[PDB]
Amino acid sequence: KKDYRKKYRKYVRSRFQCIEDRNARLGESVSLNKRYTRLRLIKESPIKMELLFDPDDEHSEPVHTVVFQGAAGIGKTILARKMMLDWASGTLYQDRFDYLFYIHCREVSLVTQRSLGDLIMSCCPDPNPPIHKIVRKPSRILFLMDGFDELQGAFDEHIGPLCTDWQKAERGDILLSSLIRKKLLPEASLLITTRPVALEKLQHLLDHPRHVEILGFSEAKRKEYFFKYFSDEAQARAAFSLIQENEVLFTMCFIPLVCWIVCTGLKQQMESGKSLAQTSKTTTAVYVFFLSSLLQPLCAHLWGLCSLAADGIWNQKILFEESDLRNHGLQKADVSAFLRMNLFQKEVDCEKFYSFIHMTFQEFFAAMYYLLELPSRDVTVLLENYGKFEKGYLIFVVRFLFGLVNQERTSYLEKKLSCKISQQIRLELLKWIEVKAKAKKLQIQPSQLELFYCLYEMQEEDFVQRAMDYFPKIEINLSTRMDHMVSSFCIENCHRVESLSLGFLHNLTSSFCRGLFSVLSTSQSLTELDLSDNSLGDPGMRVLCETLQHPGCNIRRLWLGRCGLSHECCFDISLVLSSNQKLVELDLSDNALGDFGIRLLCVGLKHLLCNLKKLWLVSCCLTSACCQDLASVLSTSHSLTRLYVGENALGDSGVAILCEKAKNPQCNLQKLGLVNSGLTSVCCSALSSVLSTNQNLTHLYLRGNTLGDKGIKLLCEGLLHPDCKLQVLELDNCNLTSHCCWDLSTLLTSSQSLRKLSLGNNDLGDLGVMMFCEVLKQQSCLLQNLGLSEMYFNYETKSALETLQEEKPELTVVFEPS
Ligand SMILES: Nc1ncnc2c1ncn2[C@@H]1O[C@H](COP(=O)(O)OP(=O)(O)OP(=O)(O)O)[C@@H](O)[C@H]1O
Ligand SMILES: CN1CCC[C@@H](Nc2nnc(-c3ccc(C(F)(F)F)cc3O)c3c2CCC3)C1
Secondary structure, eight states, rough: OHHHHHHHHHHHHSSSSSSSOSSSSSOOOOGGGGOOOOOOOOOOOBSSSSSSSOOSSTTOOOEEEEEEEOOOOSHHHHHHHHHHHHHHTSSSSTTTOEEEEEEETTTTOOOOOOOOEEEHSSSSOOOOOOOOTTTOHHHHHEEEEEEEGGSSSSSOOOOOHHHHHHSOBBOHHHHHHHHHHTTTTOOOOEEEEOOOOHHHHTTOSSSSSSEEEEOOHHHHHHHHHHHHSSSSSHHHHHHHHHHHHHHHHHHHSSSSHHHHHHHHHHHHHHTOOOOOOOOOOSSHHHHHHHHHHHOOOOOHHHHHHHOOOOOOEEEEEEOBOHHHHTTTTOOSHHHHHHHHTTEOOOOOOOOOOOOEEEEEHHHHHHHGGGGGGOOOOOHHHHHHHOOOOOGGGGHHHHHHHHOOOSSOOOOOOGGGGGGHHHHHHHHHHHHHHHHHHHHHOOSSSSSSSHHHHHHHHHHHHHHHHHHHHHOSSEEEEOOOOHHHHHHHHHHHHHHSEEEEEEOOOOOOGGGGGHHHHHTTOOOOOOOOEOSSSSSOOHHHHHHHHHHHTTTTOOOOOOEOOOOOOOTTTHHHHHHHHHHHHHOOOOEEEOOOOOOHHHHHHHHHHHSOOOOOEEEEOSSSSSSSHHHHHHHHHHHOSSOOOOOEOOOSSHHHHHHHHHHHHHTTOOOOOEEEEOOOOOOOGGHHHHHHHHTTOTTTEEEEEEETTOOOOHHHHHHHHHHHHOOOOOOOOESSSSOOGGGGGHHHHHHHHEEEESSSSEEEOOOOOOOHHHHHHHHTTOOOOOOOOOOOOTOOOOOHHHHHHHHHHHHHHTTTTOOOOO
């Protein structure tokens, strides 16, 4: 006679009022979830806490599945709890979902066979809810899978027997897969929280997810967290100030877990009348510091604890029974000690399982196990399984293992580590880096950013430098301040990096990136800097321009890409060209360098001592109005030899102006990249004058103009001139047809300077090609690709071309279409 939804909501509202559903809450005080600090959500572009499933603007298409992703300790699990509570309180999705079902991926194993009893297991104490009634209705429920990457057991996407029908019992991975794929209870919305490392598995199940990334605390939010943690503002201020001075620790504290660990550590020593010691710089240092302060005041059974953690990692166990603790010599002692000073939790949510505070802690202890004095005790085995889902990726186990190896160590727990073992681990870790650094493949295992963090953690100059000698190239993507901090350290200590690519991600449009650019200026060996495909807008270009004026810059190639360069920022680029004596190549493609921007660039290019040799201005929205300045550069500049100005709005007068100055016999222009300049037959005579006059012009690219048959005739007259030295002529779709084939045939026999001639997607016809085959037999000087790309023929012509390829081997490539 009563509506179960009311009781369900009450149960959820009462249950989800604890951060970790645990005891040992600083004397088991009220959790007070009001302490929650707002996390920012970014759509893979800020998104509201609500409207996560709502339809987008395009086609009003709704999303059933939403996936949250983020770093360990970012608070994925807490955000999920907050949503659950806000719903139960009638604030979030008040009119969208009747039930929210929390699934703890730490509790649900894959091996055990079971029906979809999740709707009962996570509900109120009443064992017989109305499953067949309102609970049955699709589109009215939301599932929350919290910690996909924490699932214990092997998990494959390759499941045939998905087994729909909630009434039937099946294996956990099968049941899970069916729900994720929306085969089980179709139209049931699903929210997943996971570390990005598990996306390699989810990508095959989600099909059409919406992705949202979770960010950590902002500077203002960090302040709020620290204050909320303490009852005494004076203590919060003293603690905040200490951390703020430690720039490195403060940076790390953007992760909620890190600031939690730091706060707890400081509070515990504060209560003892200590001066608030804290010198941690690395993630490992924070965890070591925490355990040192916690256990030092105990550690006799630390080996057993480390063994327990190591066993759990290898045997796929997060939750432990009292029987498992007893089997490690842990009974009626350690558990109590770890509750008086929270190190280990009982998860007292009407349950008898024990666990670590966080998976990060469990991995820490497992790593510690490898440096002491029984699943392995072999680092080789540990490393070989690093990238495997089945072992939880072992990211922190290894990352901490690196951090725990050093010479600059003291007392307090870490003194119990064996020197001989540590030295052996160091050598094995270095060999591991060499192998992974060389194996430059796309994968979740080390991909040139993580081999870096796993180095930062070991602040030893000799080790890091030795490792860096295996990194001739660095290709990384920086997401947050933490990546900039690590990248800066690593790059600064590099001596043999020749090529660096920094794919900055949205945080730029700020001075934020300054922290890394200032490092590049001190490099002695860096040659190529690639800053393509990122929003290095005006202020980004400005800080880089300052960086590039440094006397120790030593950068030769500046490959800017779609940076969104504007009219004004080009000024700063000019100031680099006129000062920097080493820069050779510059690529400003796909920017808004309008006529104004080019004029400024040209001022720099005409400056004495500008040694720029290759200039790319492709797709720069250029018009004929600016060709006058580029023409002046070609005339006066002795160093510029390669110019690419295609994919612009140039006209006939545009190229003719460049030609009138480029024809000068003292011009050093070698490559004229008029790939797509909207050229017509009228302007061709200008190109002809240049070809017969410029003895340095070896390559002409007209791949996309509309030269036409009259145009090619005129171009031929130029090319046929005895003083023309052109080696490569590229004529892609120029709207040429059979009517001009007689001149192209003549060109092949009369011009002795050409080595390559390539016709592209144009209907030359069969007559032209057949003639080519015969004339090319007459001791032709053309050896390179004949082209005729994307052009198709009958069988007779194809046979002739195949014959040509074999009959005269001197022509390396005929390039038949098939
Ligand atoms: N908004 C917040 N307010 C207060 N504390 C927070 C917040 N977000 C995260 N924390 C801190 O994060 C810690 C919990 O980390 P959490 O369990 O969320 O990691 P996780 O990656 O979600 O783990 P799992 O993947 O197993 O769910 C808590 O100790 C808590 O203090
Ligand atoms: C994910 N994976 C591939 C991409 C690059 C790299 N990314 C990160 N890794 N680790 C942490 C990280 C956070 C917290 C703690 C601590 F809590 F233990 F201190 C350690 C960490 O190592 C973070 C990031 C980015 C966000 C914070 C590794």
